[PDB]
């Protein structure tokens, strides 16, 4: 998946369905909520840079050179932490999309065919009831199991 | 045949944040930690007169 949806206004991670009833962008509140919770906590841990280091009490030149050099060292180190955890949150986002995709594959099994990136073509027909079943985590393989097999026999021949 | 797709959010945000592998990448939502805007140019009281 290398496509960002501008239509998702609800959530960071979601679904795009095209059935007989209609076509819609629909977020998954659970995934994006847990993402926001985890990144909030990450940000708080990041802010835990201990830069309080201070001493209440040729020497003055030495204290001068020391304080200044340590300042530059720690600014470099802080920008490093920022770079690191920027990549880490972006990778976290990637993994969340992956997990959503696995949640959908698990339920669909062979009742669907992975068109590409993150798309599934059902061999059966899905209402928004049968769509929000998958989203709700309540899609049942047997309900349509043979119904799909039949249409597979139209791709077989 | 009916299809269902999975994807992620994308919004008109010019926020740029620096990863390790790549610098200056457009991110949907960022949070700033630096404050230069309040230079002040005035020496007010700090909890009491100076």
């Amino acid at each position: 998946i290398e496509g960002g949806w501008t239509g998702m206004v609800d959530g960071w991670y979601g679904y795009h369905h095209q059935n007989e009833q209609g076509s819609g962008y629909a977020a998954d509140l659970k995934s994006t909520q847990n993402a926001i919770d985890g990144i909030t906590n990450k940000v708080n841990s990041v802010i835990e840079k201990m830069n309080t280091q201070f001493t209440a009490v040729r020497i003055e030149n030495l204290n001068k050179k020391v304080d200044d050099g340590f300042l530059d060292i720690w600014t470099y180190n802080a920008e490093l932490l920022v770079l690191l955890e920027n990549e880490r949150t972006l990778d976290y986002h990637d993994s969340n999309v992956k997990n959503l995709y696995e949640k959908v594959r698990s339920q669909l099994k062979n009742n669907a065919k992975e068109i590409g990136n993150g798309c599934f073509e059902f061999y059966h027909k899905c209402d928004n009831t049968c769509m929000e079943s998958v989203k709700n985590g309540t899609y049942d393989y047997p309900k349509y199991s043979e119904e799909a097999k039949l249409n597979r026999e139209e791709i077989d021949s | 045949g009916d299809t269902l797709c999975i994807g992620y959010h994308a919004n008109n945000s010019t926020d740029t944040v620096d990863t390790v592998l790549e610098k200056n990448v457009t991110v949907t939502h960022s949070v700033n930690l630096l404050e230069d805007k309040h230079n002040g140019k005035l020496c007010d009281l700090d909890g009491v007169k100076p």
């Binding site: 830069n51 | 944040v17 991110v27 949907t28 960022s30 700033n32």
Partner: peptide
Amino acid sequence: PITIGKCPKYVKSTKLRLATGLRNVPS
């Protein structure tokens, strides 16, 4: 770098943004 009271820690850099969202990559 010289501050008094509850002040943000002084830093010698220009930008320090943390990514909190997705890579924005439209269409």
